[PDB]
A paper describes a structure:
Endo-galactosaminidases are an underexplored family of enzymes involved in the degradation of galactosaminogalactan (GAG) and other galactosamine-containing cationic exopolysaccharides produced by fungi and bacteria. The TIM-barrel core structure with fully conserved active-site residues and a negatively charged substrate crevice is conserved among all the families.
We could not detect any binding, or enzymatic cleavage of the GAG oligomers, for the T. maritima enzyme, which raises the question as to whether the T. maritima enzyme is an endo-galactosaminidase or whether GAG is not a substrate for this family. The structure is composed of tightly packed trimers stacked on each other along their common pseudo-threefold axis. While no distinct density for a bound carbohydrate was observed, difference density in the substrate-binding crevice of TmGH191 suggests that something has bound, although it could not be conclusively modelled.
Author numbering: 28 to 311
The structure:
Amino acid sequence: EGWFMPFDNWLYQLQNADPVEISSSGFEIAVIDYSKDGSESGEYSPEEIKIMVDAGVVPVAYVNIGQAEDYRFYWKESWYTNTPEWLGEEDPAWPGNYFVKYWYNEWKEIVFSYLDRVIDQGFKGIYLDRIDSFEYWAQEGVISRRSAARKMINFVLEIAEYVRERKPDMLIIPQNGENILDFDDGQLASTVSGWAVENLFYLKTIPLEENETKSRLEYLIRLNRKGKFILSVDYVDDGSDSFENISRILDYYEKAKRNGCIPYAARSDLELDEMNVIEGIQPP
């Protein structure tokens, strides 16, 4: 069910991204972190980002809007002792990431200050992680599911207003949480430029139940039909030249393209640490 696909490929790399390497790789759109090491001192310069723009690559900045990350410029040492009401527990699965009450003004103003830097660096899109934080707080019983969903929708809308006031063409791509559209009045679906998803056909190496995949696709197809691109990333490539492995990459690409999803086969380590070239396939 796969028609609106304005990019031939995409790159997801959050560590060790190299503008020169990317600029001459043949990837069309690259989602990287806004810093070489995530930290303030590693922030890409306007010039380093312009290398990619100059080669016709569309560079997009990852921004985690559902969790505080303890190595970022915004993190404060005082938060360990005098903990803000909106800073919650550490993510068992991602040490150094903390769930936040993303509806509190102070968290929003941190995220706006991060967007401020991303705009000035010359990024052409933002890729917004932990939309699914709405599910986390609902599971914790801290607020209602509807409350959380609304709050996250409104926040992404406020993020769209902030960045488009400065850069009207800025792309806006949330990651995961696409089921949040159940609570959208349609303004979020129209405001995004596209939507990115992890673990659609495969959870790492392991193929998913077809029903689970179809529920997710129900949301993505609707967006596609409205002129919104869908970036897929499955962590299917185990690094080997095995037969199993390459057949799996090819199965993933075929399932992706047949349903309108632009695929990126990433390493099953989850590190997103290199530009993952796969001879004859990625880029294609």
